[PDB]
Amino acid sequence: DGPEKNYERTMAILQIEAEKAELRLKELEVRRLMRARGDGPWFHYPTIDKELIDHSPKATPDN
């Protein structure tokens, strides 16, 4: 292989590996924020579904 092909093939390799490296660092920060604040799709632990509530008038009024 000529030097140019290896050289530009190297840059293509470096671009892929640098983009992957940045994403790995951004995922760690997103995970830290989502776990601490709970405002994201991850670490979203279930709560009781409000559709299980019965809103019909009851036997007694105060409720």
């Binding site: 050289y7 190297t10 840059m11 470096l14 671009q15 590996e17 640098a18």
Partner: protein
């Protein structure tokens, strides 16, 4: 065959023969024998080979590397720019090694050429060797086996800060 400016030699001064003896010089007759028995057949073989070479003249070229931005102009961690700058710095480092090698060859040729008068007559070569080694030492010495343009720059900036301080204290 080579650039006489890169690898200079002074003009040669050979004294003429001046015999003060009637005895024949054995070296003169051996020289004539060497010319007839060694040089001429050697020259005849070479001229045949060069005749074959002239029938097939083809060329090769010295590779030219465009200049690219230095490591000083690279944003931190920007590997695409750092890569090209790093490769350029490595090519320059090898070139500077051969520049020193050229100057050392000049010095050693002068020492042999000047004989018992080298200490005086090779001063200009000694001075040029002294300067290139100092410049080479400043650029590349003490970087370590894992050298890089980054480490090279860190050394220059340390040197520049020591020079700025010393000038201030003056």
């Amino acid at each position: 065959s080579w650039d006489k400016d890169v690898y200079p030699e002074p003009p040669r001064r050979t004294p003429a023969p001046s015999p003060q003896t009637s005895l024949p010089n054995p070296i003169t007759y051996l020289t004539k024998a060497f010319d007839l028995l060694v040089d001429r057949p050697v020259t005849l073989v070479r001229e045949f080979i060069e005749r074959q070479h002239a029938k097939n003249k083809y060329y090769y070229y010295h590779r030219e590397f465009r200049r690219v931005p230095d490591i000083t102009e690279c944003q931190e961690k920007d590997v695409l720019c750092m890569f090209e700058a790093e490769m350029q710095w490595r090519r320059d480092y090898k070139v500077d090694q051969e520049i020193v090698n050229i100057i050392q060859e000049r010095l050693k040729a002068c020492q042999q050429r000047e004989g018992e008068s080298h200490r005086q007559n090779c001063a200009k070569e000694l001075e040029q060797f002294t300067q290139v080694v100092k410049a080479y030492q400043d650029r590349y010495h003490d970087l370590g086996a894992h050298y890089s343009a980054r480490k090279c720059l860190a050394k220059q900036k340390q040197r520049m800060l020591a020079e700025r301080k010393a000038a201030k204290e003056a």
